[PDB]
Design a protein around this ligand. Structure first.
Ligand code: H7N
Ligand code: H7N
Ligand code: H7N
Ligand code: H7N
Lengths: 315, 315
């Protein structure tokens, strides 16, 4: 069931692996970061023009949080409906640049403003630093909506991987603290369960991009030893109550370890009486949502996600 | 439990029931048709302008099949990706007019051409006349693609209720006959199982729009007595094999008898390794997709469906 374009890219990665490039799972996460980050940038399709890009920062819990805003083409209104995007990369790698092309394409298609967040990475800052910045960024942008040129009424969050995880947590956190949370959550191949191993986590543990070897490498950096795995910030799937959470878009990939716990989360939402959209892209891998130089499916997904959020806010 | 807008409409329908002297369940099929068809037209929100509308017909199995084409605004290309729409109404009521506003709105949003089909109705022509016209219409438009100003590469089908049923069958029929079937199937709260009663068919049998009394009234007209209920043209959910069917959009409503068998069909598709999008609109009723004069959610759904198909064909 693997697609030609997907299989093609897997050949390339197999060539490089067995020909000089070590993979190595180099623990100088600080060293490895710089190498992989450059690869990620190249993996993204060439960036589409937008109306306006803006770089800025603000005060976080423990630091300055950097951010970048993309205003979509031919969108004249001051306050726009706005998505707050958290990049992927195991709370260890990635940055605004690795997901720039994707955010540009999302804003154009959705006819919505996008605000990429640059949150504290591990190991330099471990659990729970990353999601604390994720939550602070939402609260800040919510409370200073007009400053960020954003309609407070139609304010959403989303991400991929660790990013998608981080998004789902921000929504729970808000409901738990009984304050106004997001209007919409866009969850792309997110990780929702640290407490156990699904079928897919075992079935695709090796050979399909994201490897079990990679997930350990990330885990050892992000998580201090002896941290309760049934913490909802690590495992939001284990929440008792799913009611009062915002409408969701949830996307999974066919050859993804994080497939089964992805659809699981989506199901918990549907039965809780929440407006939900689930989608499976069979025959592509984890990370296709931003490897848009190699996988067209990624661009189709970029378009589909953008479209469902757009239709929700009626843009 | 329900939405305000949904609850609001339900009581009005309840006003007439005892308030005046109504009752479709108790009318001659041919008489009732004329009355309800006019109500349906009024139930639709005011029609959006399009680039071009075109009426025509062609030779079917047993008769002339009428049709109407909607070309979307600011779409200059000759051959467009095209959806073939089958109206709802228990294979007994409805026509192109009852679903005109909705088709117009779909074409604009999706940036795709829409072709509403006017298929033979019961009791005048019972099972299996309606779906036979449904299949002939697709085959014809497929084989004369450029005549109908349509990209053959990106040709889809869809509908609501009996229409959604009719769409799902066209795709199966094509795969069974080992010929080129549609590229995409848009299934809106469709009926997929005649062979038994789900939980929702019982739980919402009375008081929420579609009534069990209505479904019987339709059934007695459409279906010759002593017809095997496990026929796949009546019950496409009971198909052995789901592989080789086109990518799907599937939508259900919270207070719909046809809810459980809707999601069931969607699930059969996901496990068959087909690219699928499922969505539930909780706290609205069956038929909201075209009662867009009363229910905003309907317009949001109209937009969402259009958007997912658009993103698929990359318009
Ligand atoms: C080297 C390819 C992997 C890129 C990161 C995918 P996502 O951030 O994975 C999340 C898993 C959380 C430990
Ligand atoms: C009075 C409202 C009529 C709505 C018709 C919905 P659809 O045609 O349902 C199919 C019925 C299955 C036998
Ligand atoms: P991942 O699946 C590596 C699996 C080896 C784990 C060590 C036992 O990388 C896939 C690379 C493309 C072929
Ligand atoms: P059916 O579900 C039952 C007729 C009214 C009984 C109220 C419990 O048709 C419903 C139409 C909306 C009142």
């Amino acid at each position: 069931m693997l697609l030609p374009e997907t299989r093609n890219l897997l050949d390339l990665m197999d060539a490089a692996t067995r020909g000089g490039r070590p993979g190595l799972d180099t623990l100088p996460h600080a060293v490895g970061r710089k190498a992989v980050d450059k690869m990620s940038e190249d993996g993204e399709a060439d960036p589409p023009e937008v109306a306006e890009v803006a770089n800025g920062g603000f005060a976080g819990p423990a630091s300055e949080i950097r951010f970048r805003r993309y205003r979509p083409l031919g969108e004249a209104a001051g306050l726009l409906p706005t998505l707050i995007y958290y990049h992927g990369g195991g709370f260890v790698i990635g940055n605004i640049e690795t997901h720039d092309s994707t955010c540009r394409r999302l804003a154009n298609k959705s006819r919505c403003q996008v605000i990429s967040i640059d949150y504290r990475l591990a190991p330099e800052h471990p659990f729970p630093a990353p999601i604390d910045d994720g939550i602070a960024a939402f609260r800040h942008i919510r409370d200073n909506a007009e400053s960020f040129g954003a309609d407070a009424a139609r304010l959403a969050v989303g991400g991929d991987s660790a990013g998608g995880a981080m998004a789902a947590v921000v929504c729970q956190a808000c409901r738990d603290a009984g304050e106004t949370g997001p209007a919409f959550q866009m969850l792309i191949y997110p990780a929702t369960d640290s407490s156990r191993e699904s079928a897919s986590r075992v079935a695709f543990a090796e050979g399909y991009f994201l490897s079990k070897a990679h997930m350990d490498w990330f885990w050892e950096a992000y998580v201090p030893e002896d941290t309760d795995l049934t913490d909802l910030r690590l495992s939001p799937l284990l929440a008792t109550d799913f009611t009062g959470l915002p409408p969701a878009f949830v996307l999974t990939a066919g050859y993804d370890p994080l497939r089964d716990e992805g659809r699981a989360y989506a199901d918990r939402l549907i039965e809780a009486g929440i407006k939900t959209t689930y989608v499976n892209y069979p025959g592509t891998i984890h990370g296709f949502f931003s490897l848009t130089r190699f996988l067209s499916q990624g661009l189709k997904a970029n378009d589909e996600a953008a479209a469902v959020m757009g239709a929700h806010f009626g843009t």
